[PDB]
Design a protein around this ligand. Structure first.
Ligand code: MG
Ligand code: MG
Lengths: 225, 225
């Protein structure tokens, strides 16, 4: 079956625009500067992925929240809160594997490289703008996983019908700003001063608002080889 | 009793900052270029205001939504959806009266000038940023009600503990942009291209993102006399 990669099953996506593909096929590529193979997988519904992984990601996100430097949340989410948050619409998981399917009961602390969600950033009239949030396994720090996650995003978001990308809060202290978003030609379309009270910072941290046109993307950025 | 104007009863406001006043006292002033008196009232909870008014505002908002030019919603809200939306945290009603209390069963189509909500625009670490949405009774068009609503906002938002104001979507075709926000020195801290599909516009409409520092406001703008 291929129900698990059918755009027909897209929940809570764009109101005014249809998907540009009937399916999202898993995307294989190598980690930057490596011969190690990774595969990105679509997640239209949580049932199409193993519970053990979901529960892993659950913990991964709360650790990221508990660090207090990246996301605006103060507190850790409940399991149901996390499901409603990360899997409200669409998500992606990226695994260190060469297989074109997700296998059960894997050692996620090794195999899980990263994940992100994609949802409409606004209500229906503006729902062609998508938002995304990203997480990288800390065990795979320093391997440029976040950059690859962004390329996958650039490849897949438009396929869901999105025409433009919005990140509402990217903290200047977040190295993804200059390591990734700037590198991929995401525009800093705004700045919020003193936006966030963050763990380990005496003063409030400014936040960047990033935008990008998903209809006019640089092939250089789309290519994973 | 004065429970109805106690900041102690503020629901779902800022996590890190307390109110600067123990109460919000109703604010009287005149409509611009007029001797007609208006009074602004705090709403910390819907129980402190008459149902007939709430039901009026309910309809007023859905008309505004149905126009399809100002808000991102496509569809009219249910009564419970509207309550959860407009009264999630704080709200204000502005009435054409000289009284310092809200009276029941009034002719709102005449007496209701306008309303707005104030809530945190983000989760806790960034919850000192407030969002607001405004509505003016169409029967009082052309009387500069929206400008006064903004001045009330500027007076009261900081009192709730907010330090900065964010409007995430103000459509360029919305005359409030230049009639009000620009006039009151709200900065256009960003722009989203083609943000919204709007009723009566062939092409997508850009949206402005407005910010303002609520700790350093111009007294000129705060004064209602
Ligand atoms: Mg196909
Ligand atoms: Mg007092």
């Amino acid at each position: 079956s291929i129900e698990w990669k059918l755009t027909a099953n897209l929940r809570n996506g764009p109101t005014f625009f249809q998907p540009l593909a009937d399916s999202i096929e898993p995307l294989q590529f190598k980690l930057i500067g490596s011969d190690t193979v990774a595969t990105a997988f679509p997640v239209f519904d949580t049932k199409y992925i193993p519970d053990s992984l979901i529960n892993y990601l659950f913990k991964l996100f709360n650790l990221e929240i508990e660090s207090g430097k990246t996301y605006p949340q103060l507190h850790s989410l409940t399991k149901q809160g996390f499901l409603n948050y990360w899997f409200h619409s669409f998500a992606v998981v990226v695994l260190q594997t060469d297989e074109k399917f997700i296998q059960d009961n894997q050692d996620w602390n090794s195999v899980l490289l990263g994940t992100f969600y994609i949802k409409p950033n606004y209500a229906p009239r503006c729902s062609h703008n998508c938002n995304a949030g990203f997480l990288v396994n800390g065990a795979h720090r320093g391997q440029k996983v976040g950059y690859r996650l962004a390329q996958v995003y650039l490849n897949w978001a438009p396929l869901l019908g999105y025409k433009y990308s919005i990140f509402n809060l990217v903290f200047v202290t977040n190295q993804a700003s200059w390591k990734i978003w700037d590198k991929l030609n995401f525009q800093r379309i705004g700045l919020v001063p003193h936006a966030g009270i963050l763990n380990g910072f005496s003063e409030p941290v400014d936040a960047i608002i990033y935008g990008k046109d998903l209809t006019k993307i640089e092939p250089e950025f789309l290519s994973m080889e």
